[PDB]
Amino acid sequence: FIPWFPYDGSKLPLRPKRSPPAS
């Protein structure tokens, strides 16, 4: 088993600006 897309510090991913409701 090997991951197909190893963690690349150059290409940062997208993240929702909002946060989910707290528990």
Q: Which residues bind other proteins (CB under 8 A)?
A: 1, 3-5, 7, 9, 11-23
Return d(Cα 11, Cα 23) in angstroms, integer. Answer: 31
Shortest Cβ distance from residue 5 to other proteins (Å)?
Answer: 5
Length of the chain: 23
Shortest Cβ distance from residue 6 to other proteins (Å)?
Answer: 10
Shortest Cβ distance from residue 13 to other proteins (Å)?
Answer: 4
